[PDB]
Structures are given as structure tokens and as C-alpha cells.
């Protein structure tokens, strides 16, 4: 009771994870804001089938790596190299 | 929307690198070609219009929608001392 953070273990699908992102220190999605945001929960994808992730969730951590004040590539690299299960910490 | 960026190739080349393509898709299955790095002090940075993670839509009037990575590299390398880049973001 009283936590803005969610831990979501997304199971990789045949077609990948099925969501898009934007943000980072080198790619701010908002003014003075370097957070990584989920921009699309793609139909047919695993994030949709799971049903827990929502658009404009802030990606706080991918597995064991925090995504706060990082370059956009840092989070892309962590998502592309994910295993069969990826642990996403999200803030709302 | 699209922006047409004409760049003069410098000592160090165009001053950026790319990733993506039909044979190197993004983790969300996007096959677009996009700018991965802008080299500080390079041609693209000094021009000031290109930004990292810009999607390359065309190179010297050749569309880069749904193309293999080396197609776009080949186009960038063969465009000569002046390159017309169409980008979207």
C-alpha cells in the first residue's frame, strides 16, 4: 500500500517483447525529462497478451539495470539482449 | 512529416552511424534505419539538424523503407561529397 512502482516479468514471445520506447538523456521525450517511456503496446505482441504494461509507463529498470539518467541506447541494449523472461520495473 | 537535410561530407565522413534495417530489426520489430550516434564535431553535428535516433527515410532520393542495412550504408558511402538525407522523428 503506497507504492508507485510495479515489477512486471514479461515473457518473451515468438515476435519479441512487443512494445516501443522513447526517452533518455540523449533523447529527452519531454522538457528536462530523461525518463524512458513506453510509447506503444503493439497489438499482437507479448506486452499486449500479458495485459499489464500500459503506454507512457516509465521504465525504471530492465532486469537488474536501472534506466534513470541513462542514454537511450542503454535501455535498448538491455531490452534487445533480454532472455526468455525480462523483469521490468515501471513507475506510474 | 519529413525533413530534407543536405550534408557536406567531412574529413571524418558524415559524422554519424546507423543501425536497423530488415536484417537488423529493433527489439520492437521496427526495420527502420535510424541514427545511433552523432559524432561531436562531425559534419552532422556541426550542421545542427540531425539528431540521434532520427529515422532515415531516404538517401540521395533512394528510399530506405524496409531495406537491408548494407543498402543504406552503400547509399551513404556512394553519395559523394554531398548527401541529401530525408529524416523523420
PDB file of C-alpha atoms in Angstrom:
ATOM      1  CA  UNK A   1       0.000   0.000   0.000  1.00  0.00           C
ATOM      2  CA  UNK A   2       1.523   3.231  -1.255  1.00  0.00           C
ATOM      3  CA  UNK A   3       3.981   2.160  -3.978  1.00  0.00           C
ATOM      4  CA  UNK A   4       4.223   3.868  -7.364  1.00  0.00           C
ATOM      5  CA  UNK A   5       6.472   1.081  -8.701  1.00  0.00           C
ATOM      6  CA  UNK A   6       5.414  -2.202 -10.303  1.00  0.00           C
ATOM      7  CA  UNK A   7       7.599  -5.228 -11.028  1.00  0.00           C
ATOM      8  CA  UNK A   8       6.393  -6.990 -14.196  1.00  0.00           C
ATOM      9  CA  UNK A   9       8.027 -10.168 -15.507  1.00  0.00           C
ATOM     10  CA  UNK A  10       7.203 -10.074 -19.219  1.00  0.00           C
ATOM     11  CA  UNK A  11       7.536 -13.406 -21.020  1.00  0.00           C
ATOM     12  CA  UNK A  12       9.221 -13.031 -24.401  1.00  0.00           C
ATOM     13  CA  UNK A  13       7.100 -14.137 -27.344  1.00  0.00           C
ATOM     14  CA  UNK A  14       7.812 -15.548 -30.769  1.00  0.00           C
ATOM     15  CA  UNK A  15       7.772 -11.953 -32.063  1.00  0.00           C
ATOM     16  CA  UNK A  16       9.757 -10.326 -29.253  1.00  0.00           C
ATOM     17  CA  UNK A  17       8.532  -8.145 -26.395  1.00  0.00           C
ATOM     18  CA  UNK A  18       6.004  -6.110 -28.366  1.00  0.00           C
ATOM     19  CA  UNK A  19       6.373  -2.553 -27.085  1.00  0.00           C
ATOM     20  CA  UNK A  20       8.174   0.618 -28.160  1.00  0.00           C
ATOM     21  CA  UNK A  21      10.006   3.209 -26.074  1.00  0.00           C
ATOM     22  CA  UNK A  22      11.297   6.771 -26.192  1.00  0.00           C
ATOM     23  CA  UNK A  23      13.461   8.884 -23.913  1.00  0.00           C
ATOM     24  CA  UNK A  24      16.882   9.044 -22.334  1.00  0.00           C
ATOM     25  CA  UNK A  25      19.473  11.675 -21.563  1.00  0.00           C
ATOM     26  CA  UNK A  26      20.406  11.970 -25.256  1.00  0.00           C
ATOM     27  CA  UNK A  27      16.757  11.700 -26.418  1.00  0.00           C
ATOM     28  CA  UNK A  28      14.506  13.527 -23.911  1.00  0.00           C
ATOM     29  CA  UNK A  29      10.850  12.781 -24.563  1.00  0.00           C
ATOM     30  CA  UNK A  30       9.800  15.829 -22.513  1.00  0.00           C
ATOM     31  CA  UNK A  31      11.413  19.087 -21.446  1.00  0.00           C
ATOM     32  CA  UNK A  32      14.251  18.441 -18.982  1.00  0.00           C
ATOM     33  CA  UNK A  33      12.929  14.861 -18.628  1.00  0.00           C
ATOM     34  CA  UNK A  34      15.280  11.956 -19.342  1.00  0.00           C
ATOM     35  CA  UNK A  35      12.931   9.134 -18.313  1.00  0.00           C
ATOM     36  CA  UNK A  36      12.293   6.173 -20.615  1.00  0.00           C
ATOM     37  CA  UNK A  37       8.613   5.969 -21.584  1.00  0.00           C
ATOM     38  CA  UNK A  38       6.636   3.150 -23.190  1.00  0.00           C
ATOM     39  CA  UNK A  39       5.195   4.717 -26.339  1.00  0.00           C
ATOM     40  CA  UNK A  40       3.260   1.752 -27.774  1.00  0.00           C
ATOM     41  CA  UNK A  41       1.900  -1.592 -26.577  1.00  0.00           C
ATOM     42  CA  UNK A  42       1.884  -3.165 -30.019  1.00  0.00           C
ATOM     43  CA  UNK A  43      -1.140  -5.296 -30.994  1.00  0.00           C
ATOM     44  CA  UNK A  44      -0.304  -8.961 -31.435  1.00  0.00           C
ATOM     45  CA  UNK A  45       2.747  -8.634 -29.192  1.00  0.00           C
ATOM     46  CA  UNK A  46       3.690 -10.154 -25.865  1.00  0.00           C
ATOM     47  CA  UNK A  47       3.202  -6.976 -23.821  1.00  0.00           C
ATOM     48  CA  UNK A  48      -0.399  -6.812 -25.055  1.00  0.00           C
ATOM     49  CA  UNK A  49      -1.064 -10.501 -24.388  1.00  0.00           C
ATOM     50  CA  UNK A  50       0.320 -10.065 -20.868  1.00  0.00           C
ATOM     51  CA  UNK A  51      -2.031  -7.116 -20.387  1.00  0.00           C
ATOM     52  CA  UNK A  52      -0.237  -5.354 -17.518  1.00  0.00           C
ATOM     53  CA  UNK A  53       2.015  -2.826 -19.263  1.00  0.00           C
ATOM     54  CA  UNK A  54       0.437   0.483 -20.261  1.00  0.00           C
ATOM     55  CA  UNK A  55       1.546   3.240 -22.599  1.00  0.00           C
ATOM     56  CA  UNK A  56       3.665   6.013 -21.054  1.00  0.00           C
ATOM     57  CA  UNK A  57       4.730   3.777 -18.218  1.00  0.00           C
ATOM     58  CA  UNK A  58       8.193   4.916 -17.136  1.00  0.00           C
ATOM     59  CA  UNK A  59      10.782   2.137 -17.454  1.00  0.00           C
ATOM     60  CA  UNK A  60      12.725   2.299 -14.186  1.00  0.00           C
ATOM     61  CA  UNK A  61      14.729  -0.925 -14.521  1.00  0.00           C
ATOM     62  CA  UNK A  62      15.263  -3.750 -17.015  1.00  0.00           C
ATOM     63  CA  UNK A  63      16.234  -6.930 -15.173  1.00  0.00           C
ATOM     64  CA  UNK A  64      18.875  -5.624 -12.740  1.00  0.00           C
ATOM     65  CA  UNK A  65      19.869  -2.388 -14.536  1.00  0.00           C
ATOM     66  CA  UNK A  66      18.343   0.970 -13.643  1.00  0.00           C
ATOM     67  CA  UNK A  67      17.290   3.213 -16.532  1.00  0.00           C
ATOM     68  CA  UNK A  68      17.393   6.585 -14.753  1.00  0.00           C
ATOM     69  CA  UNK A  69      19.605   9.281 -16.301  1.00  0.00           C
ATOM     70  CA  UNK A  70      20.906   6.854 -18.938  1.00  0.00           C
ATOM     71  CA  UNK A  71      21.309   7.130 -22.687  1.00  0.00           C
ATOM     72  CA  UNK A  72      18.507   5.737 -24.832  1.00  0.00           C
ATOM     73  CA  UNK A  73      20.862   3.042 -26.131  1.00  0.00           C
ATOM     74  CA  UNK A  74      21.470   1.730 -22.605  1.00  0.00           C
ATOM     75  CA  UNK A  75      17.821   0.686 -22.343  1.00  0.00           C
ATOM     76  CA  UNK A  76      17.564  -0.540 -25.938  1.00  0.00           C
ATOM     77  CA  UNK A  77      20.609  -2.749 -25.371  1.00  0.00           C
ATOM     78  CA  UNK A  78      19.086  -4.207 -22.205  1.00  0.00           C
ATOM     79  CA  UNK A  79      15.789  -4.976 -23.956  1.00  0.00           C
ATOM     80  CA  UNK A  80      17.310  -6.448 -27.125  1.00  0.00           C
ATOM     81  CA  UNK A  81      19.556  -8.757 -25.070  1.00  0.00           C
ATOM     82  CA  UNK A  82      16.719  -9.939 -22.814  1.00  0.00           C
ATOM     83  CA  UNK A  83      16.239 -13.643 -22.194  1.00  0.00           C
ATOM     84  CA  UNK A  84      13.046 -15.654 -22.301  1.00  0.00           C
ATOM     85  CA  UNK A  85      11.861 -13.580 -19.318  1.00  0.00           C
ATOM     86  CA  UNK A  86      12.508  -9.860 -18.828  1.00  0.00           C
ATOM     87  CA  UNK A  87      11.847  -8.200 -15.472  1.00  0.00           C
ATOM     88  CA  UNK A  88      10.539  -4.660 -15.969  1.00  0.00           C
ATOM     89  CA  UNK A  89      10.239  -2.201 -13.101  1.00  0.00           C
ATOM     90  CA  UNK A  90       7.798   0.543 -14.078  1.00  0.00           C
ATOM     91  CA  UNK A  91       6.684   3.748 -12.370  1.00  0.00           C
ATOM     92  CA  UNK A  92       3.252   5.343 -12.723  1.00  0.00           C
TER      93      UNK A  92
ATOM     94  CA  UNK B   1       6.367  14.857 -41.576  1.00  0.00           C
ATOM     95  CA  UNK B   2       9.823  14.619 -43.171  1.00  0.00           C
ATOM     96  CA  UNK B   3      12.854  16.918 -43.163  1.00  0.00           C
ATOM     97  CA  UNK B   4      15.366  17.015 -46.031  1.00  0.00           C
ATOM     98  CA  UNK B   5      18.923  17.520 -44.737  1.00  0.00           C
ATOM     99  CA  UNK B   6      21.733  18.175 -47.214  1.00  0.00           C
ATOM    100  CA  UNK B   7      25.119  17.369 -45.647  1.00  0.00           C
ATOM    101  CA  UNK B   8      28.652  18.000 -46.911  1.00  0.00           C
ATOM    102  CA  UNK B   9      30.912  15.030 -46.197  1.00  0.00           C
ATOM    103  CA  UNK B  10      33.770  15.962 -43.878  1.00  0.00           C
ATOM    104  CA  UNK B  11      37.233  14.666 -43.048  1.00  0.00           C
ATOM    105  CA  UNK B  12      35.594  12.119 -40.737  1.00  0.00           C
ATOM    106  CA  UNK B  13      32.739  11.363 -43.128  1.00  0.00           C
ATOM    107  CA  UNK B  14      29.153  12.400 -42.453  1.00  0.00           C
ATOM    108  CA  UNK B  15      29.682  12.269 -38.691  1.00  0.00           C
ATOM    109  CA  UNK B  16      27.101   9.671 -37.690  1.00  0.00           C
ATOM    110  CA  UNK B  17      26.489   5.932 -37.581  1.00  0.00           C
ATOM    111  CA  UNK B  18      23.302   3.983 -38.247  1.00  0.00           C
ATOM    112  CA  UNK B  19      21.578   0.823 -37.096  1.00  0.00           C
ATOM    113  CA  UNK B  20      18.426  -1.004 -38.099  1.00  0.00           C
ATOM    114  CA  UNK B  21      17.295  -2.481 -41.374  1.00  0.00           C
ATOM    115  CA  UNK B  22      15.300  -5.537 -42.384  1.00  0.00           C
ATOM    116  CA  UNK B  23      18.197  -7.782 -41.311  1.00  0.00           C
ATOM    117  CA  UNK B  24      18.890  -5.911 -38.034  1.00  0.00           C
ATOM    118  CA  UNK B  25      15.440  -5.005 -36.689  1.00  0.00           C
ATOM    119  CA  UNK B  26      14.750  -3.150 -33.473  1.00  0.00           C
ATOM    120  CA  UNK B  27      13.542  -5.133 -30.468  1.00  0.00           C
ATOM    121  CA  UNK B  28      10.000  -3.990 -31.347  1.00  0.00           C
ATOM    122  CA  UNK B  29      10.472  -5.446 -34.881  1.00  0.00           C
ATOM    123  CA  UNK B  30      10.918  -1.999 -36.457  1.00  0.00           C
ATOM    124  CA  UNK B  31      13.134  -2.444 -39.526  1.00  0.00           C
ATOM    125  CA  UNK B  32      13.728   1.301 -39.933  1.00  0.00           C
ATOM    126  CA  UNK B  33      17.226   2.703 -40.362  1.00  0.00           C
ATOM    127  CA  UNK B  34      17.989   5.167 -37.581  1.00  0.00           C
ATOM    128  CA  UNK B  35      20.943   7.227 -36.392  1.00  0.00           C
ATOM    129  CA  UNK B  36      22.680   5.514 -33.462  1.00  0.00           C
ATOM    130  CA  UNK B  37      25.469   8.026 -32.810  1.00  0.00           C
ATOM    131  CA  UNK B  38      26.217  11.621 -33.764  1.00  0.00           C
ATOM    132  CA  UNK B  39      29.968  12.266 -33.602  1.00  0.00           C
ATOM    133  CA  UNK B  40      30.611  15.561 -31.756  1.00  0.00           C
ATOM    134  CA  UNK B  41      32.461  17.940 -34.051  1.00  0.00           C
ATOM    135  CA  UNK B  42      31.457  15.953 -37.126  1.00  0.00           C
ATOM    136  CA  UNK B  43      29.563  17.135 -40.175  1.00  0.00           C
ATOM    137  CA  UNK B  44      26.105  16.130 -38.938  1.00  0.00           C
ATOM    138  CA  UNK B  45      26.560  17.726 -35.508  1.00  0.00           C
ATOM    139  CA  UNK B  46      28.080  20.949 -36.856  1.00  0.00           C
ATOM    140  CA  UNK B  47      25.124  21.231 -39.245  1.00  0.00           C
ATOM    141  CA  UNK B  48      22.844  21.008 -36.213  1.00  0.00           C
ATOM    142  CA  UNK B  49      19.743  19.497 -37.824  1.00  0.00           C
ATOM    143  CA  UNK B  50      20.302  15.748 -37.401  1.00  0.00           C
ATOM    144  CA  UNK B  51      19.635  14.155 -34.014  1.00  0.00           C
ATOM    145  CA  UNK B  52      20.483  10.680 -32.722  1.00  0.00           C
ATOM    146  CA  UNK B  53      17.651   8.153 -33.225  1.00  0.00           C
ATOM    147  CA  UNK B  54      16.406  10.097 -36.234  1.00  0.00           C
ATOM    148  CA  UNK B  55      14.911   7.671 -38.743  1.00  0.00           C
ATOM    149  CA  UNK B  56      16.469   7.795 -42.217  1.00  0.00           C
ATOM    150  CA  UNK B  57      13.688   7.758 -44.809  1.00  0.00           C
ATOM    151  CA  UNK B  58      15.866   8.327 -47.894  1.00  0.00           C
ATOM    152  CA  UNK B  59      19.461   8.847 -49.032  1.00  0.00           C
ATOM    153  CA  UNK B  60      20.063  10.844 -52.235  1.00  0.00           C
ATOM    154  CA  UNK B  61      16.449  10.250 -53.325  1.00  0.00           C
ATOM    155  CA  UNK B  62      16.653   6.495 -52.627  1.00  0.00           C
ATOM    156  CA  UNK B  63      14.020   5.337 -50.150  1.00  0.00           C
ATOM    157  CA  UNK B  64      15.326   3.378 -47.166  1.00  0.00           C
ATOM    158  CA  UNK B  65      11.939   1.990 -46.105  1.00  0.00           C
ATOM    159  CA  UNK B  66      12.233  -1.763 -45.482  1.00  0.00           C
ATOM    160  CA  UNK B  67      15.790  -2.200 -46.791  1.00  0.00           C
ATOM    161  CA  UNK B  68      18.760  -4.225 -45.618  1.00  0.00           C
ATOM    162  CA  UNK B  69      21.337  -2.421 -43.512  1.00  0.00           C
ATOM    163  CA  UNK B  70      24.070  -2.522 -46.162  1.00  0.00           C
ATOM    164  CA  UNK B  71      21.726  -0.964 -48.734  1.00  0.00           C
ATOM    165  CA  UNK B  72      21.736   2.234 -46.678  1.00  0.00           C
ATOM    166  CA  UNK B  73      25.460   2.042 -45.893  1.00  0.00           C
ATOM    167  CA  UNK B  74      26.161   1.546 -49.597  1.00  0.00           C
ATOM    168  CA  UNK B  75      23.977   4.562 -50.423  1.00  0.00           C
ATOM    169  CA  UNK B  76      25.643   6.775 -47.803  1.00  0.00           C
ATOM    170  CA  UNK B  77      29.127   5.750 -48.928  1.00  0.00           C
ATOM    171  CA  UNK B  78      28.335   6.230 -52.635  1.00  0.00           C
ATOM    172  CA  UNK B  79      26.526   9.581 -52.277  1.00  0.00           C
ATOM    173  CA  UNK B  80      29.742  11.538 -52.808  1.00  0.00           C
ATOM    174  CA  UNK B  81      30.761  14.747 -51.088  1.00  0.00           C
ATOM    175  CA  UNK B  82      27.134  15.919 -50.757  1.00  0.00           C
ATOM    176  CA  UNK B  83      24.345  13.795 -49.282  1.00  0.00           C
ATOM    177  CA  UNK B  84      20.619  14.572 -49.200  1.00  0.00           C
ATOM    178  CA  UNK B  85      19.112  12.840 -46.165  1.00  0.00           C
ATOM    179  CA  UNK B  86      15.367  12.654 -45.573  1.00  0.00           C
ATOM    180  CA  UNK B  87      14.567  12.022 -41.909  1.00  0.00           C
ATOM    181  CA  UNK B  88      11.505  11.804 -39.696  1.00  0.00           C
ATOM    182  CA  UNK B  89      11.099  11.936 -35.920  1.00  0.00           C
TER     183      UNK B  89
END
